């Protein structure tokens, strides 16, 4: 039962179709990885403040997964016969709460979800500073309470109940949060980072302990029942789309150009050019891959600048021999390509059974590399070696978990020895580490946006710099947080007003979170 | 080079010139409120966007090709007793092509057109429209009297295969058309010319076996460069299918669809159907899914396009199609959700390269006779009501005989003619019924359709401003009543252009009524 509550909360993390709209609408534009689909460009790409769209994480987690995890934790707390499920619940509670606070800032946590259990309504919004304090304390204690000789964890879609891997994940999350606070508090950050490395079970040191939620393959449906079906990855469902021929996932130029201009082996693993005239209405079957034809004919790729739609600017196309040939037996096909020259997200990332990414060994290597550049006491491996290991693991992650074609040693070496190289100054090293992390986090948009904001890399420019300033109703600078749902002023007035007063008296998506020291 | 060959080319060019036919899709079909919703039709004619290049198509095409060549051939065969038949046919076709020019622009070169082969005879004067019409009656009368079936064979005639008696019938029927045209501006001359034509050698077109239809061949539609010099197929039908046929097919205007549907017209679903085009060929109307009966069974409203509307504005109310859901099982690109498919489209029978080039029909002759009888002219012993009824029956049978539409039975015809297709009782009711039925007949003859709407005042059409689209009408609120002269004329035929515009007070505006158009 607590074990069943874990299962459902894991499924809801990427399985909730309503919630996943937030990432397509906002995060993927803010990190300049996708742009051109109507939803992504309209909301995040052009800074449309929309309180209902911004509210999806808040409502989803406080009404469902976070609420239920809190209940289950409470019911198993201080029970020596339930220490493993209780500890696992505490780790997952920290994880879900980290998404909330890294989106909105101060928020209910210590007093959350206690109305039925403790008659405690109107929970205060804990200060982000204090939420992060609690993350380190909860994770450390959970690691120390876990005992493999005790209860079996049975509803775990990440590690199949292996509580030693749960210690590795908890200590890796301590690394992530330590590095998160390293601008505002380098001293505490270094201490937390070093403590985690020394903690029981260690950290995730290779991909065999990557934390990935397992999802199944279910046909993509947008009917009403689909909004209560968490069995499939709903982020992948939306990246395919409710309107998949008009509004697929086109890549942003910032990301496509980072890959292409650096010679990254992942360029045409993450993206392809497809003609979709024969594509299924409900799955990415029967697409025509024109990528190699475009390369052979010298046709320029036209990825979407921040602020651009697939149709604005309208691209320069070409006449496809592949499509002309196909039209002979499939007369609905046209040979004239237009928006097909704009790179799209590859089919490997559009599957109901894509994993729900929580944390990878590649990220741990990048965290270790940055801590080493920062002169923390993290071990005997050079920062450069840790960096190279993180890049290799990030590239292999796509092969292992999405079926992308394997990258040879020669291909990796060619890349790492040219534009993927680590660099020779601290700023170049931190730039390379965090640019590589941004690519790794493509399938983890919550972490991708948090790490862009925290590290300041890549250095992203407003859509105004690309010519789209006339559309920026919600202001010029890329938002650094989302606003609280307006109904909170009705359901939780005092606590909401208190949080807003702490920000200076307004709820503004340009206000930096506590751990975010400056913006870009 | 041979005059008989020049006749063939000029006939083919009349509807075979893919560049020139854009004018009808862009302007005429919107001004007569028969098609609306296709981008081109709504943007230009539906929202009064004046564009001199678009308005110039008839002038440029005819004066550089078909009319020029007809004039050359007429000169080469004139005053030669052994060439009287080809010469007379050329004179009749010359009048026909000239009538389209003057009914579009007003005063225009005629007596002085097409010289230049002579010497420095460039810079022709614009003959006054009133005089052009007088010349039409004289030319047609003389050609009828010079024709002699014992003399030269006419060998390249795609209308009548050289049957010169039928050319007499066409010439005298054109005299009826032009006599009725001038019946508001010069009622006494109109009556005299109408009566003279009925009494002339060869008589008029009295049944469908003498309908004047240019025969076109069944060629595949192509929009490549070579297709702009290929006149073998009906290019108006090609354009009504469209260069962008899935995004911008020919949707019907509500004025015309509602006239048909609300009158119980048997032609309603002969001229129009609702289609889902997800599997339709890119270059032909093959593989469309007819949903019309399904909509009727499910009670889904037809949503034809008001004047000024695009297919996407207003966005219509759709439904979920059982037919399409079934087709999606084996054709997964199909969606079952219909949206703009609820807007009636032009039926496939009107989207064929072998659709005839309509010049003049026996149905029109019956409607002209009926109107002349209401006007108390001396036209014979048939009642106006019977002539009207014969006109409607011929107009309906015209679609069966020439477009492959399902035949209308006597019982179906009688049911319509006895109810909402009835002739009516006051003079205004009779004139409205005659000219509303003529408007339907002239659907496949847009030059005549627009002329007769302007001349008769029926149907009574309202500006797109009355349907809510006034904000978009850059070229004025009233529906245009002529097109302006080409900029090529004001640039390179300036003295003659200046003389013509001086007769309109120095103006050259699409709201200025032509001489035969007494009011709007
Ligand atoms: O002629 C011979 C000659 O030819 C030569 O070739 C020529 C050729 O002939 C010629 O045709 C060609 O011309 C080119 C021309 O074709 C081209 O046209 C372009 C044009 O330039 C573009 O501007 C145009 O762009 C369009 C685009 O197509 C549209 O798709 C787009 O539509 C936008 C919509 O997508 C968008 O819709 C969104 C809704 O607004 C929104 O409300 C909705 O919200 C949903 C949401 O998505 C859901 O996720 C959500 O789900 C909720 C959930 O949130 C909650 O949790 O739960 C609920 C239930 O529980 C659940 O419901 O729901 C909400 C609510 O429903 O999302 C929608 C999207 O999904 O809306 C916006 C705004 O309205 C739309 O904008 O619009 C754009 C424009 O705006 O595209 C056309 C193409 O069609 O132009 C070029 C350049 O001019 C031309 O060149 O030219 C060639 C070459 O010259 C030959 O060369 C020659 O040889 C021959 O001779
Ligand atoms: O999700 C859970 C939930 O879902 C529920 O269902 C939801 C669902 O989720 C959601 O997606 C859906 O959202 C709906 C949304 O989809 C819909 O979107 C609409 C939108 O509202 C519209 O506004 C939009 O309209 C677009 C339209 O699509 C475009 O096509 C159109 O494009 C126009 C162009 O077509 C046009 O192009 C022309 C060029 O401008 C012009 O230059 C060019 O000229 C050519 C010319 O044509 C030639 O003839 C000529 O030929 C020359 C010749 O002249 C010479 O002689 O010779 C030459 C060669 O020799 C020769 O070339 O040449 C020239 C060449 O240029 O012609 C072009 C046309 O062909 O350009 C204009 C202007 O730029 C374009 O406008 O634009 C419009 C917009 O303006 O469409 C989208 C759809 O895509 O919105 C609705 C309503 O908001 C949404 O509802 O909602 C559903 C329902 O809720 C489920 O129900 C639930 O269960 C689930 O839970
Ligand atoms: Mg920052
Ligand atoms: Mg008039
Ligand atoms: Na889903
Ligand atoms: Na043609
Ligand atoms: Na008949």
CA atoms within 13 A on the CB side of A16: 19
> What DSSP state is assigned to residue B27?
I
Q: Which two tokens stand for residue B517?
A: 């158009």
Residue from the list B284, B287, B333 with its beta carbon closest to the beta carbon of A279:
B333
Q: Check chain A for breaks (C–N over 2.5 Å) and list the residue before each, or none.
A: none
State the Rg of chain A over Cα: 23
Query: CB–CB of A329/A237 below 8 Å?
Result: no
Closest chain B C-alpha to A52 CA, distance in angstroms: 24
Query: Which of these, A3, A2, A5, A7, lies nearest to A356 by C-alpha position?
Result: A7
Query: CB–CB of A481/A513 below 8 Å?
Result: yes
List, in order, residues 6 or more apart from A295 with CB less than 8 Å away. none
Query: CB–CB of B492/B118 below 8 Å?
Result: no
Task: Give the span between the Cα atoms of B59 and B461, in whole angstroms.
Answer: 26
End-to-end CA distance of chain B: 44
Size of interface A-B (CB pairs under 8 A): 28
Q: What does the DSSP assignment read for B403-421?
A: H-PPPPPHHHHHHHHTTTT
Alpha-carbon distances of B76 from A248, B82, B112, B310, rounded to whole Å? 63, 12, 16, 49
Q: Which two tokens stand for residue B349?
A: 């029978």
Q: Which two tokens stand for residue B248?
A: 């911008």
Helix (H, G, I), strand (E, B) or coil at A194: helix
Task: Give the span between the Cα atoms of A338 and A326, in whole angstroms.
Answer: 17
Task: Give the span between the Cα atoms of B43 and B30, in whole angstroms.
Answer: 9
Query: Which of these, A51, A345, A9, A303, lies nearest to A156 by C-alpha position?
Result: A9
Helix (H, G, I), strand (E, B) or coil at B81: helix
Query: CB–CB of A254/A458 below 8 Å?
Result: yes
Residue whose CA lies nearest to ligand 1 atom number 11: B244
- CATH placement of domain B363-444: 1.20.120.840
CB of A242 closer than 6 angstroms to any ligand 1 atom: yes
Query: CB–CB of A68/A27 below 8 Å?
Result: no
| Chain A contact present for B120, CB below 8 A | no
CB of B229 closer than 6 angstroms to any ligand 1 atom: no
Query: CB–CB of B478/B511 below 8 Å?
Result: yes
Helix (H, G, I), strand (E, B) or coil at A313: coil
Kindly tell me the sign of the dihedral angle through the C-alpha atoms of A78, A79, A80, A86.
negative
CA angle, residues A456, A459, A463, in degrees to nearest 5 = 120
Query: Which of these, A10, A45, A16, A38, lies nearest to A468 by C-alpha position?
Result: A45
Task: Give the span between the Cα atoms of A215 and A360, in whole angstroms.
Answer: 17
Helix (H, G, I), strand (E, B) or coil at B36: coil
Query: Which of these, B452, B479, B352, lies nearest to B36 by C-alpha position?
Result: B479
> What DSSP state is assigned to residue A275?
E
Characterize A5-25 residue by residue with b for buried, 16 or more Cβ atoms within 10 angstroms of its Cβ, and e for exposed: bbebbbbbbbbbbebbbbbbb
Task: Give the span between the Cα atoms of B141 and B135, in whole angstroms.
Answer: 10
Domain ranges of chain B: 244-350, 363-444
Task: Give the span between the Cα atoms of B28 and B104, in whole angstroms.
Answer: 10
Task: Give the span between the Cα atoms of B178 and B200, in whole angstroms.
Answer: 15
Query: Which of these, A200, A209, A203, A149, lies nearest to A175 by C-alpha position?
Result: A203
Q: Which two tokens stand for residue A335?
A: 């040979």
User: Could you tell which of B25, B315, B318 is best to mutate to test the pocket of ligand 2, judged by most ligand atoms within 8 Å of the CB?
Assistant: B315
Q: How far is the CA of B258 from the centre of ligand 7 (A)?
A: 25
CA atoms within 13 A on the CB side of A173: 30
* Residue A337, strand partner residues: A318
Burial class, A377, CB count within 10 angstroms (exposed 0-12 / middle 13-18 / buried 19+):
exposed
* Residue B30, strand partner residues: none
Residues with CB under 6 A from ligand 2: A 222-223, 242-243, 246; B 19, 22, 39-40, 228, 243-244, 247-248, 312, 315
Task: Give the span between the Cα atoms of A273 and A282, in whole angstroms.
Answer: 19
Alpha helices for A181-233 (secondary structure H): 186-198
Closest atom of ligand 2 relative to the A246 alpha carbon: 84
Task: Give the span between the Cα atoms of A57 and A34, in whole angstroms.
Answer: 20
Alpha-carbon distances of B448 from A331, B181, B209, B403, B476, rounded to whole Å? 36, 10, 20, 19, 24
> What DSSP state is assigned to residue A34?
B
Q: What does the DSSP assignment read for A439-454?
A: HHGGG-HHHHHHHHHH
* Residue A250, strand partner residues: A344
| Chain B contact present for A338, CB below 8 A | no
Query: CB–CB of A450/A376 below 8 Å?
Result: no
CA A193 from centre of chain:
22
Residue from the list A280, A286, A332 with its beta carbon closest to the beta carbon of B281:
A332
Query: CB–CB of A153/A85 below 8 Å?
Result: yes
Phi, psi of B385 (to 5 degrees): -60, -45
Q: How far is the CA of B439 from the centre of ligand 1 (A)?
A: 35
Helix (H, G, I), strand (E, B) or coil at A226: helix
Kindly tell me the sign of the dihedral angle through the C-alpha atoms of A168, A172, A175, A181.
negative
Count other Cβ atoms within 10 Å, centred on residue B498: 13
Closest atom of ligand 2 relative to the B225 alpha carbon: 60
A327 contact residues in B (CB cutoff 8 A) = 282
Closest atom of ligand 2 relative to the B244 alpha carbon: 70
A333 contact residues in B (CB cutoff 8 A) = 282
DSSP element (H, E) containing A224: none
List, in order, residues 6 or more apart from A511 with CB less than 8 Å away. A105, A480, A481, A503, A504
Closest chain B C-alpha to A353 CA, distance in angstroms: 20
Count other Cβ atoms within 10 Å, centred on residue B222: 14
Count other Cβ atoms within 10 Å, centred on residue B34: 26
Query: Which of these, A305, A315, A314, A253, lies nearest to A463 by C-alpha position?
Result: A305
For residues B275, B281, B284 and B288, what is the CA-based torsion angle, rounded to 10 degrees? -20
Helix (H, G, I), strand (E, B) or coil at B272: strand
Q: Which two tokens stand for residue A9?
A: 């909360």
| Chain A contact present for B279, CB below 8 A | yes
Q: Which chain A residue is nearest to residue B282, measuring alpha carbons?
A: A332
Angle between helices B164-181 and B84-105 (to 10 degrees): 30
Query: Which of these, B6, B441, B12, lies nearest to B215 by C-alpha position?
Result: B12
Residue carrying the six token digits 């006449």: A319
Report every protein residue that has its C-beta within 5 angstroms of ion ligand 7. B 208, 394, 397
Query: CB–CB of B111/B94 below 8 Å?
Result: no
């Amino acid at each position: 039962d607590p074990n069943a509550q874990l299962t459902t909360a894991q499924l809801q993390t990427y399985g909730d179709l309503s919630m996943m709209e937030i990432y397509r609408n906002y995060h993927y534009a803010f990190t300049q990885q996708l742009m051109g689909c109507w939803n992504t460009t309209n909301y995040g790409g052009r800074h449309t403040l929309d309180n209902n769209e911004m509210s999806r994480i808040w409502t989803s987690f406080y009404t469902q997964s976070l609420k239920n995890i809190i209940d289950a934790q409470y019911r198993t707390a201080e029970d020596a016969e339930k220490v493993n499920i209780n500890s696992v619940l505490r780790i997952y509670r920290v994880y879900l709460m980290s998404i909330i606070t890294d989106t909105y800032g101060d928020a209910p946590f210590s007093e959350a979800g206690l109305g039925f259990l403790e008659g405690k309504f109107n929970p205060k919004y804990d200060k982000q500073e204090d939420i992060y304090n609690a993350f380190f304390l909860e994770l450390e204690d959970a690691v120390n309470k876990i005992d493999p000789t005790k209860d079996k964890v049975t509803g775990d879609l990440i590690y199949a109940g292996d509580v030693t891997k749960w210690q590795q994940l908890a200590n890796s999350l301590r690394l992530r949060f330590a590095m998160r606070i390293s601008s505002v508090n380098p001293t505490k950050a270094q201490t937390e980072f070093e403590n985690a490395l020394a903690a029981n079970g260690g950290v995730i040191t290779d991909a065999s302990s990557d934390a990935l939620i397992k999802y199944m393959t279910i046909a993509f449906s947008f009917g009403q029942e689909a909004y209560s079906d968490y069995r499939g990855n709903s982020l992948s469902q939306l990246l395919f789309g409710n309107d998949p021929a008009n509004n697929p996932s086109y890549l942003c130029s910032t990301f496509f150009n980072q890959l292409y201009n650096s010679g990254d082996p992942r360029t045409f693993k993450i993206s392809r050019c497809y003609y979709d005239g024969l594509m299924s209405a409900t799955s990415p079957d029967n697409r025509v891959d024109i990528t190699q034809e475009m390369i052979e004919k010298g046709i320029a790729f036209s990825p979407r600048d921040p602020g651009a739609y697939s149709w604005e600017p309208w691209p320069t196309g070409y006449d496809s021999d592949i499509c002309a040939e196909l039209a002979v037996n499939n007369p609905s096909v046209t040979a004239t390509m237009a928006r097909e020259v704009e790179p799209k997200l590859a089919n490997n990332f559009l599957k109901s059974d894509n994993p729900g990414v929580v944390m990878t060994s590649a990220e741990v290597k990048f965290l270790m590399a940055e801590a080493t550049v920062k002169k923390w006491n993290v071990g005997s491996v050079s920062a450069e070696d840790l960096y190279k290991q993180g890049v290799r693991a990030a590239i292999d992650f796509l092969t292992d978990n999405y079926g992308c074609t394997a990258t040879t040693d020669a291909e990796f070496d060619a890349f790492i020895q040219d534009k993927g190289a680590f660099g020779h100054t601290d700023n170049q090293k931190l730039e390379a580490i965090n640019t590589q992390a941004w690519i790794l986090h493509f399938t983890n948009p919550a972490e991708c946006w948090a790490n862009v904001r925290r590290s300041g890399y890549p250095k992203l420019k407003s859509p105004a710099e690309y010519g789209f300033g006339q559309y920026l109703t919600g202001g010029t600078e890329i938002p650094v947080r989302l606003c609280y749902p307006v109904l909170e002023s009705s359901y939780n007035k005092k606590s909401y007003n208190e949080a807003i007063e702490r920000m200076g008296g307004t709820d503004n998506w340009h206000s930096l979170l506590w751990w975010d020291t400056e913006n870009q």
